[PDB]
Design goal:
The chain is an alpha+beta fold. It folds into three domains: 166 residues, Sulfite Reductase Hemoprotein, domain 1 (2-Layer Sandwich), CATH 3.30.413; 144 residues, Sulfite Reductase Hemoprotein,Domain 2 (Sulfite Reductase Hemoprotein, domain 2, Alpha-Beta Complex); 143 residues, 2-Layer Sandwich (Sulfite Reductase Hemoprotein, domain 1). The protein is 30% helix and 21% strand. It has 13 helices and 22 strands. It has a five-stranded antiparallel sheet with strand order 5-1-4-3-13. A five-stranded antiparallel sheet has the order 2-16-17-12-11. It has a five-stranded mixed sheet with strand order 6-7-8-9-10. The longest helix has 18 residues. The radius of gyration is 21 Å and the shape is globular. It starts with a strand and ends with a helix. Potassium ion binds next to loops. GO terms for molecular function: 4 iron, 4 sulfur cluster binding; heme binding; metal ion binding; NADP binding; sulfite reductase (NADPH) activity. Keywords: 4Fe-4S, Amino-acid biosynthesis, Cysteine biosynthesis, Heme, Iron, Iron-sulfur, Metal-binding, NADP, Oxidoreductase. Pfam families: NIR_SIR, NIR_SIR_ferr.
Length: 456
């Protein structure tokens, strides 16, 4: 279990070949596991720092996790600057000791693919005339909970205000230090930023950040999100460039009988002009493909089974690693997701909603790595084969789903969804998401203030 610092999930084709080699020859599993934080993991390492350092990669006292950045913006030209900033914040935050681990993102509306509400500090990019002018700052997200411990809770980030580009690093540093100083000095399970904010208050925390940064926040600049999914397939970039996002189930890159996913990515890496981008949805973008090269790349991806069509449901589902490698796993996640979505796909077809999707996530234990606490339908592992079923989040990921059923099995989960999906298929308003529908139709009460109303 070794993880690399890879801001924005951008990795070169050279770096890819290096990690592909190591993964194959020096680990028990032989796989490359793309994570939902835009980096990769090796499992069962049997020097790695030299191998990493040799291609210019460094694995993260340092409570800082990988800084995320919207991987495939609709306004393609914005990525370069946003990525440059994610990278600078990353280097800037590198060693103070944080009470708990600190997570940061750079978001480019209208996409919340990085799932900002699961993070401590978020910089939402504001652009004027194709140029970034500043960031809206949202602080305090965190999903980790402890079963039956009403003192823990998932929380969404709070808006602090807008800041011109020039103040970015000063503000980033100020949030980190304020949290470091005010974080709970006694208990580890309450030292996270989401808890500090609720203890001292957003305005109190905010005022301190302004004092330390040497700035005064301006009012929030308008922004909205329309989704969190990747743009599977070919999308037109800038110039004559194209981006091919490949759906990779569970982000597990391995050669399977008749689906040489790993070798395929190696073949592509060898002829690929630009680089790759690991997404927050555990997928991979082959970025900067000249129009003339599309066919070459597509042929390989197609042959290798990297372009096998899946339903929109499968593309919008996610699970954490869990067993067999995670020591904290309570129930299967990555290994349960595939057949579970086979079941959900059947249910979607049965109700005539096969072209629809429900943001569905499974996390193997309450730590919440699979980000089930920001899903429309979240499954939270409680024991072997048993999960807590949560409903009521929304497509864009700005609402925490309340627990609907507790410690139930797959057959029980499937029966409840069969029924709920049916009602949604028939009673929903035009373009209404499943999560919103369960809340509208009174199937589940919404979570309006997590620190106070998440638990029944
Ligand atoms: C690989 C990854 C899951 C995935 O399927 O993509 C994952 C995997 C693990 N996470 Fe996580 N976490 C990962 C994203 C997150 C997220 C979601 C996110 O950041 O977008 C969360 C929820 C958000 C949050 O932090 O509140 C998350 C909250 C945790 C926690 C609980 C943190 C807390 O504040 O209490 C732990 C346990 C701990 O650190 O104590 C943890 C622990 C772990 C460990 C490293 C278990 C351990 O401590 O020994 C898991 C490794 C399993 C394995 O065998 O590989 N992981 N984990 C995601 C790796 C991110 C990365 O590259 O660093
Ligand atoms: S949610 Fe739990 S089981 Fe899943 S990877 Fe994180 S710590 Fe392990
Ligand atoms: K995926």
């Amino acid at each position: 279990l070794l993880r690399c610092r890879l801001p924005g999930g951008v990795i070169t084709t050279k770096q890819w070949q290096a990690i592909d080699k190591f993964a194959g020859e020096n680990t028990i599993y032989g796989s490359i596991r793309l994570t939902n934080r835009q980096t990769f993991q090796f499992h069962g390492i049997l020097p790695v720092h030299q191998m990493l350092h040799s291609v210019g990669l460094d694995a993260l006292n340092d409570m800082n996790r990988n800084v995320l950045c919207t991987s495939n913006p609709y306004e393609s030209q914005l990525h370069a600057e946003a990525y440059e900033w994610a990278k600078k914040i990353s280097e800037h935050l590198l060693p103070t000791y944080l009470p708990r681990k600190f997570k940061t993102t750079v978001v480019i509306p209208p996409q919340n693919d990085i799932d900002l509400h699961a993070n401590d500090m978020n910089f939402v990019a504001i652009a004027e005339n194709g140029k970034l002018v500043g960031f809206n700052l949202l602080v305090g997200g965190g999903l980790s909970i402890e079963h039956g411990n009403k003192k823990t809770y998932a929380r969404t980030a709070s808006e602090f205000g807008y800041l011109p580009l020039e103040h970015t690093l000063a503000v980033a540093e100020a949030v980190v230090t304020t949290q470091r100083d005010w974080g709970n000095r006694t208990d580890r399970k309450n030292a996270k930023t989401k808890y500090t904010l609720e203890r001292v208050g957003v305005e109190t925390f905010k005022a301190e950040v302004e004092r330390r940064a040497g700035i005064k926040f301006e009012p929030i600049r308008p922004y909205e999100f329309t989704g969190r999914g990747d743009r599977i397939g070919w999308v037109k970039g800038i110039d004559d460039n194209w981006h091919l996002t490949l759906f990779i189930e569970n982000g597990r890159i391995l050669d399977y009988p008749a689906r040489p996913l790993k070798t395929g990515l190696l073949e592509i890496a060898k002829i690929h002009k630009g680089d790759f981008r690991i997404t927050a949805n555990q997928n991979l973008i082959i970025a900067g493909v000249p129009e003339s090269e599309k066919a070459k790349i597509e042929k390989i991806a197609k042959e290798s089974g990297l372009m096998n069509a899946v339903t929109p449901q499968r593309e919008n589902s996610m699970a954490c690693v869990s067993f067999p490698t995670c020591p904290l796993a309570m129930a299967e996640a990555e290994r349960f997701l595939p057949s579970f979505i086979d079941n959900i796909d059947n249910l979607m077809a049965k109700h005539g909603v096969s072209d629809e999707h429900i943001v569905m996530r499974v996390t193997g234990c309450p730590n919440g790595c699979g980000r089930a606490m920001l899903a429309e339908v979240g499954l939270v592992g409680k024991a072997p084969g048993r999960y807590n079923l949560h409903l009521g989040g929304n497509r864009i990921g700005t609402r925490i789903p309340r627990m609907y059923k507790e410690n139930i099995t797959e057959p029980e989960i499937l029966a409840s969804l069969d029924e709920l999906i049916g009602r949604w298929a028939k009673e929903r308003e035009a373009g209404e998401g499943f999560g919103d529908f369960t809340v509208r139709a009174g199937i589940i009460r919404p979570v309006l203030d997590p620190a106070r109303d998440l638990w029944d």
